[PDB]
Swiss-Prot record:
Induction: Through a myriad of surface receptors including the TCR/CD3 signaling complex, coreceptors, or chemokine receptors. Homooligomerizes; this association negatively regulates kinase activity. Interacts with PPIA/CYPA; this interaction regulates TCR signal strength via a proline-directed conformational switch in ITK. Interacts with THEMIS. Interacts with FASLG. Interacts with VAV1; this interaction is important for VAV1 localization and TCR-induced actin polarization. Interacts with TBX21. The chain holds residues 177 to 238 of 625 of the full protein. The gene is Itk. The N-terminal PH domain allows ITK to be recruited to the plasma membrane by an activated PI3 kinase. This domain also contains a proline-rich region (PRR). The adjoining domain is a SH3 domain, which binds to PRR (from itself or from other proteins). Next, a SH2 domain is required for binding tyrosine-phosphorylated substrates. In the C-terminal region, the kinase domain is required for tyrosine phosphorylation. The modification Phosphotyrosine is found at residue 12. Tyrosine kinase that plays an essential role in regulation of the adaptive immune response. Regulates the development, function and differentiation of conventional T-cells and nonconventional NKT-cells. When antigen presenting cells (APC) activate T-cell receptor (TCR), a series of phosphorylation lead to the recruitment of ITK to the cell membrane, in the vicinity of the stimulated TCR receptor, where it is phosphorylated by LCK. Phosphorylation leads to ITK autophosphorylation and full activation. Signal peptide: none annotated. It is found in: Cytoplasm; Nucleus. Belongs to the protein kinase superfamily. Tyr protein kinase family. TEC subfamily. Residues 3-63 form the SH3 domain. This is Tyrosine-protein kinase ITK/TSK.
Amino acid sequence: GSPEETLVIALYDYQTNDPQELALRCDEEYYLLDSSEIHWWRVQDKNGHEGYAPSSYLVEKSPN
């Protein structure tokens, strides 16, 4: 139970001002797309919104 794609949780409320970054909410989670990364982790909201998200300000939820 861990197909490349997974979910993440934003530790802190990180608000952005660009369509490249995705607005994050504390306690909220998102759909992880690019995890192999080295640069910026892509995330997608259940609302169809996507953007970059600091991997440092979140943690892998990993479904059991």
